[PDB]
Amino acid sequence: KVNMDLRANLKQVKKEDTEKEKDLRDVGDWRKNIEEKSGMEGRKKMFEAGES
């Protein structure tokens, strides 16, 4: 099923951060990770009140 092999090959984790993420069809776990990480983690890192 090369067709798919190619599809998945490309069609995958696609995000540019900054409130712009694209979860492929796989999502499931891939997403769960990013899905969660992204956003929340973005705010944390964006915050981290405290230098060095």
The CATH number of residue 52's host domain is: 6.10.250.180
- d(CA 29, CA 37) in angstroms, rounded, equals 12
* 38 CB burial (10 A radius; 0-12, 13-18, 19+): middle
Rounded (5°) CA angle 20-51-44: 30
Expressed as residue numbers, the domain containing 16 is 1-52
Method used for this model? NMR
Angle at 45 between CA 41 and CA 49, to 5 degrees: 130
Return all residues near 38 (Cβ < 8 A) that are at least 6 apart: 15, 17, 21
Q: How many domains does the structure of the chain reveal?
A: 1
- Tell me the chain's radius of gyration from C-alpha atoms: 15
Please answer whether residues 34 and 21 qualify as being in contact, where contact means their C-beta atoms are separated by less than 8 angstroms.
yes
Residue 15's alpha-carbon distances to 1, 2, 11, 22, 38, in angstroms, are 26, 25, 11, 5, 9
